[PDB]
């Protein structure tokens, strides 16, 4: 579910190890883990 999770995860192992977070359209956005 979610604006592609997969791929998303991967923005958050490039960004930031936060596996919170939150998804937009095309984006993604992790939190303060």
């Known amino acids: 579910a979610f604006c592609n999770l997969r791929m998303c995860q991967l923005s958050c192992r490039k960004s930031l190890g936060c596996l919170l977070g939150k998804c ?7 939190y303060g883990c």
Not at 24 to 30: E, N
């Open 24 to 30: 937009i359209g095309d984006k993604c956005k992790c």
